[PDB]
Amino acid sequence: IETVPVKLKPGMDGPKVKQWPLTEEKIKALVEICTEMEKEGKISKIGPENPYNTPVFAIKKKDSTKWRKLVDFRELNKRTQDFWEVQLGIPHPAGLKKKKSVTVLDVGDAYFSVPLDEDFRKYTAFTIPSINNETPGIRYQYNVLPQGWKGSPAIFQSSMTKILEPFKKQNPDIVIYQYMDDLYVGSDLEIGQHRTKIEELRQHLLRWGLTEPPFLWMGYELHPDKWTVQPIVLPEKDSWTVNDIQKLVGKLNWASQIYPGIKVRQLSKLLRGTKALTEVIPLTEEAELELAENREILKEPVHGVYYDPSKDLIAEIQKQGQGQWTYQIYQEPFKNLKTGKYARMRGAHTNDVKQLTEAVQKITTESIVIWGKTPKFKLPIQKETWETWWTEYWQATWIPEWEFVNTPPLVKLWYQ
Amino acid sequence: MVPISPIETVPVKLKPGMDGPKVKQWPLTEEKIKALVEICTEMEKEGKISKIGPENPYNTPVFAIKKKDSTKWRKLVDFRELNKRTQDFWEVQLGIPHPAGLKKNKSVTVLDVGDAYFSVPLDEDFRKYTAFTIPSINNETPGIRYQYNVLPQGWKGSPAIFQSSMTKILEPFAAQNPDIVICQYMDDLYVGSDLEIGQHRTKIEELRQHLLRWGLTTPDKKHQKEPPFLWMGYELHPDKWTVQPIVLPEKDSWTVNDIQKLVGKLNWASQIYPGIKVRQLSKLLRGTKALTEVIPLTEEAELELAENREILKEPVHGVYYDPSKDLIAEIQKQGQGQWTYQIYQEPFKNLKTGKYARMRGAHTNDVKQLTEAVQKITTESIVIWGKTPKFKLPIQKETWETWWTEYWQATWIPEWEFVNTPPLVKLWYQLEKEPIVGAETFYVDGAANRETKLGKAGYVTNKGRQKVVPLTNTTNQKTELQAIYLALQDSGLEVNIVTDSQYALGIIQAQPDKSESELVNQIIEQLIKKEKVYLAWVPAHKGIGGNEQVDKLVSA
Numbered sequence: 028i029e030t031v032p033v034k035l036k037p038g039m040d041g042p043k044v045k046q047w048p049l050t051e052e053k054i055k056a057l058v059e060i061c062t063e064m065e066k067e068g069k070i071s072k073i074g075p076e077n078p079y080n081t082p083v084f085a086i087k088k089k090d091s092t093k094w095r096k097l098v099d100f101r102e103l104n105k106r107t108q109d110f111w112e113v114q115l116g117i118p119h120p121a122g123l124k125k126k127k128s129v130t131v132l133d134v135g136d137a138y139f140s141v142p143l144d145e146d147f148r149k150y151t152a153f154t155i156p157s158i159n160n161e162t163p164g165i166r167y168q169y170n171v172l173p174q175g176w177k178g179s180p181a182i183f184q185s186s187m188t189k190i191l192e193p194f195k196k197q198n199p200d201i202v203i204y205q206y207m208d209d210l211y212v213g214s215d216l217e218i219g220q221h222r223t224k225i226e227e228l229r230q231h232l233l234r235w236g237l238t239e240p241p242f243l244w245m246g247y248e249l250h251p252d253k254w255t256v257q258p259i260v261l262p263e264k265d266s267w268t269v270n271d272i273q274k275l276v277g278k279l280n281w282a283s284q285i286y287p288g289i290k291v292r293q294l295s296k297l298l299r300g301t302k303a304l305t306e307v308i309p310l311t312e313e314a315e316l317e318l319a320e321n322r323e324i325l326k327e328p329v330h331g332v333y334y335d336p337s338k339d340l341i342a343e344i345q346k347q348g349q350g351q352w353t354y355q356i357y358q359e360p361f362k363n364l365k366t367g368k369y370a371r372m373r374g375a376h377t378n379d380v381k382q383l384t385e386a387v388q389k390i391t392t393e394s395i396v397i398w399g400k401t402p403k404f405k406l407p408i409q410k411e412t413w414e415t416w417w418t419e420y421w422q423a424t425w426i427p428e429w430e431f432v433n434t435p436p437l438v439k440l441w442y443q
Numbered sequence: 444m445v446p447i448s449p450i451e452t453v454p455v456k457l458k459p460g461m462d463g464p465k466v467k468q469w470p471l472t473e474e475k476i477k478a479l480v481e482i483c484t485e486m487e488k489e490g491k492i493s494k495i496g497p498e499n500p501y502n503t504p505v506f507a508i509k510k511k512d513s514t515k516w517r518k519l520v521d522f523r524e525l526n527k528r529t530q531d532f533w534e535v536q537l538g539i540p541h542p543a544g545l546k547k548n549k550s551v552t553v554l555d556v557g558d559a560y561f562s563v564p565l566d567e568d569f570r571k572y573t574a575f576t577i578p579s580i581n582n583e584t585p586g587i588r589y590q591y592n593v594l595p596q597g598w599k600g601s602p603a604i605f606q607s608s609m610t611k612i613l614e615p616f617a618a619q620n621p622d623i624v625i626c627q628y629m630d631d632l633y634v635g636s637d638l639e640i641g642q643h644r645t646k647i648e649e650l651r652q653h654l655l656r657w658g659l660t661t662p663d664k665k666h667q668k669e670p671p672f673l674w675m676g677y678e679l680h681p682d683k684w685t686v687q688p689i690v691l692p693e694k695d696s697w698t699v700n701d702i703q704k705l706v707g708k709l710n711w712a713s714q715i716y717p718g719i720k721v722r723q724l725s726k727l728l729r730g731t732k733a734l735t736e737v738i739p740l741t742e743e744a745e746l747e748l749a750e751n752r753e754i755l756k757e758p759v760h761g762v763y764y765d766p767s768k769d770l771i772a773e774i775q776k777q778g779q780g781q782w783t784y785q786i787y788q789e790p791f792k793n794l795k796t797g798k799y800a801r802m803r804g805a806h807t808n809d810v811k812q813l814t815e816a817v818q819k820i821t822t823e824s825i826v827i828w829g830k831t832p833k834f835k836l837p838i839q840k841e842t843w844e845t846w847w848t849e850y851w852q853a854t855w856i857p858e859w860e861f862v863n864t865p866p867l868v869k870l871w872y873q874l875e876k877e878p879i880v881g882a883e884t885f886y887v888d889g890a891a892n893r894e895t896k897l898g899k900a901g902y903v904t905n906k907g908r909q910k911v912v913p914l915t916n917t918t919n920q921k922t923e924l925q926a927i928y929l930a931l932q933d934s935g936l937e938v939n940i941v942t943d944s945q946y947a948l949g950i951i952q953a954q955p956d957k958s959e960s961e962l963v964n965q966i967i968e969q970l971i972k973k974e975k976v977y978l979a980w981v982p983a984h985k986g987i988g989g990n991e992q993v994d995k996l997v998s999a
């Protein structure tokens with residue numbers, strides 16, 4: 028019933044972000060949604076004495092037909108102070124990424140039962156725009172904890188460790204993690220009474236909430252245990268052409284920036300001479316051997332590869348063609364903490380951007396599980412194409428950071 | 444008394460930590476002082492201002508201006524200082540509507556609200572900051588002191604707070620009358636509907652009624668206005684709209700400022716006048732920042748301008764949005780990285796039009812530009828109609844397919860169809876995916892001496908063909924390109940080229956079809972002529988024979 032004190036970081040003013048164009052359907056949805064929210068005290072209309080703004084839009088969640096409101100608290104979140112006035116941090120559950128089944132729940136709706144500090148409210152201002160700026164924009168602000176705000180899981184955390192006390196103690200093998208509006212629930216059992224343990228975990232948020240929820244019935248089904256990392260592999264051929272060997276050497280020269288003992292002397296030595304690209308070169312013993320030693324090296328791990336929560340996670344993505352994408356997460360160049368590949372992107376076979384968008388979401392979900400933070404992406408797409416379309420495909424309640432890549436990497440090959 | 448609802452007041456604060464204004468009142472001639480005392484007396488009677496004590500220590504200067512060809516003076520208070528110290532507001536005017544997005548209105552009425560404006564009170568605790576002093580005759584007396592009770596003309600928050608207060612009042616009327624549209628412009632309200640004009644003046648009378656509830660009268664002795672309506676630079680009519688008349692001046696002397704005002708009008712007009720070109724006119728603007736500089740017009744600039752005047756020789760109109768029918772956008776290539784578009788619903792009845800300029804780069808291609816254009820149009824259409832128009836585009840379905848399927852970046856355009864109106868956009872060349880069998884293999888390389896600027900470029904092949912050419916005033920990057928150019932120049936219709944240049948690869952993997960480096964253009968020109976070209980990269984200085992052979996050959 029009583030609010031938690033909140034302020035911004037010193038020297039920083041509140042967010043003033045432009046609202047970007049919305050389609051008619053997303054406007055209608057948002058208006059209806061906000062009409063009910065205001066009618067329940069979750070938000071209230073505000074005046075011109077409020078210079079602040081945060082963008083807003085609408086999405087349809089995964090396998091659902093209901094519009095969800097999604098605020099883009101990315102700016103407010105940077106400018107919202109960090110949260111250490113009871114806890115000093117949640118020592119990320121390193122066991123979550125080792126479960127047969129981790130399910131992801133939308134518990135965001137629980138947030139709206141807790142009020143927001145009256146002095147902080149002005150900072151959550153948002154505008155539902157109008158088509159053509161005809162009518163003026165409807166301006167609301169938040170009276171409660173908002174879905175998507177960094178503060179909501181932190182403030183509500185006091186109350187959440189509660190609701191879980193039963194089920195937790197009555198199921199000590201389950202790992203439970205919370206990141207924004209998402210609750211990540213990792214069992215070790217069988218998918219069917221997964222859909223029992225998950226089923227009975229829903230209860231409490233009903234059970235507690237009585238003293239209907241919109242997307243509480245939803246469940247995302249992960250498997251960090253069948254999560255496929257990647258090694259680097261060289262081809263195994265009976266016949267090598269000069270091209271085959273030139274590419275091989277190219278790749279190896281590149282792995283050497285990562286792995287130490289990589290040698291290309293003997294292999295280049297076959298490429299001594301001005302030969303035709305398609306000509307077959309037989310391998311010398313000296314070369315077959317050097318290739319084999321290099322293979323042994325690529326099998327082992329990288330050396331001195333550590334995560335450092337003090338730092339940024341960076342995600343690169345390359346488009347490989349035919350629905351396949353490859354990606355790498357790292358903090359230091361050539362020190363991959365994870366690599367991966369994605370090979371048949373759902374309902375998007377003719378749409379590059381839909382694929383890329385779903386890709387960014389999968390990689391983010393994975394990054395939340397492994398490190399409890401999102402990465403900053405390096406997308407292979409012009410800023411303007413991406414900025415135009417990603418909202419149409421976005422199905423997650425959070426949003427990562429991203430920058431753009433306008434120069435074609437050679438690296439694309441080496442990961443194909 | 445007919446009780447009237449108060450206009451709710453908006454709490455206004457000064458900027459954080461800052462204080463109000465304390466500015467020296469300017470000395471005034473006796474004439475101006477007498478003038479001001481009258482003006483303020485009447486205003487005080489109207490409740491707009493109130494006399495304050497000598498406590499209030501804030502001051503904004505006040506002035507007197509004699510309206511030209513009127514013996515009358517007018518009062519001018521200089522809030523510039525107080526504006527600097529008043530907070531930020533959520534301003535609404537940021538987006539002006541675009542005519543093409545409106546729906547036709549049979550009847551459109553115009554109401555005056557220069558009197559409603561002063562029905563908007565200024566927040567109680569902020570009034571003190573609006574203090575000013577009319578000096579006394581001979582400074583022989585304390586200057587009279589006044590403070591504001593209403594939003595002052597020329598204050599930071601007046602428009603934001605005035606606009607919002609009106610909307611707040613109008614909201615229930617607008618919402619229970621969904622067959623009416625209302626707009627705010629200067630001291631005036633404009634209301635249209637699409638009803639027979641009897642049913643319409645009814646609803647105006649209903650509105651005049653509703654406004655009275657807040658004690659607002661909107662003069663029924665209304666305005667001489669008739670179509671068209673001059674508004675934000677346009678010409679609004681009941682059924683159509685165009686830009687407020689565009690007239691291109693004749694000159695025998697064009698200056699940086701002259702041409703500047705000429706593109707502005709051309710840009711502004713390019714939103715309804717189809718096929719309008721800029722470029723060679725904004726080319727003459729490149730860099731030169733002297734507003735008076737008499738730049739000479741190229742023979743491209745004169746022909747482009749004479750293509751303009753011909754398009755502006757007669758007026759054209761845009762229609763209004765008919766939500767029931769589809770929205771179509773059509774694009775055309777104009778050369779020099781110029782694109783031009785029309786958005787329409789039925790053939791030849793444009794709603795608006797426009798042009799897109801290629802992005803400042805060093806290498807580019809038609810497919811990329813079309814895409815960027817498509818996206819610009821897409822966002823524009825979301826802003827104006829709330830939907831994406833269907834595209835008609837001068838690019839074969841097959842071309843686009845090959846492009847996006849092989850491009851290294853992700854890319855997309857919304858629903859679209861091919862429109863066969865030249866010049867069609869095409870892919871000019873396509874690199875092989877595998878090496879070519881029977882095609883000669885050219886190992887190339889280039890190097891320059893960073894100080895002398897001398898370097899060499901050349902190749903060697905499986906067939907014993909060789910070349911090394913020497914070069915002055917060149918760089919490593921130029922010599923690596925030049926080398927590739929030699930190989931293309933001296934080979935047959937099919938060729939395999941091996942280079943160690945990451946730089947060069949990076950340029951050709953971007954698949955440009957035009958460049959600012961004439962050297963890249965020559966290469967493109969060569970590529971276009973070939974039947975098959977496989978470009979292969981190998982790392983330098985790793986003694987890959989072939990490569991090493993020509994590296995030792997060009998670092999001599």
Ligand SMILES: Cc1cc(/C=C/C#N)cc(C)c1Nc1nc(Nc2ccc3scnc3c2)c2nc[nH]c2n1
Binds near residue numbers: 544625634679
């Ligand atoms: C009613 C209105 C009047 C004006 C006129 C400004 C002046 N002077 C400008 C605007 C932007 C509007 N707003 C408006 N206008 C619409 N149509 C319209 C159609 C024809 C004319 S002629 C003069 N004004 C108009 C207005 C409209 N259709 C759906 N929503 C709409 N909103």
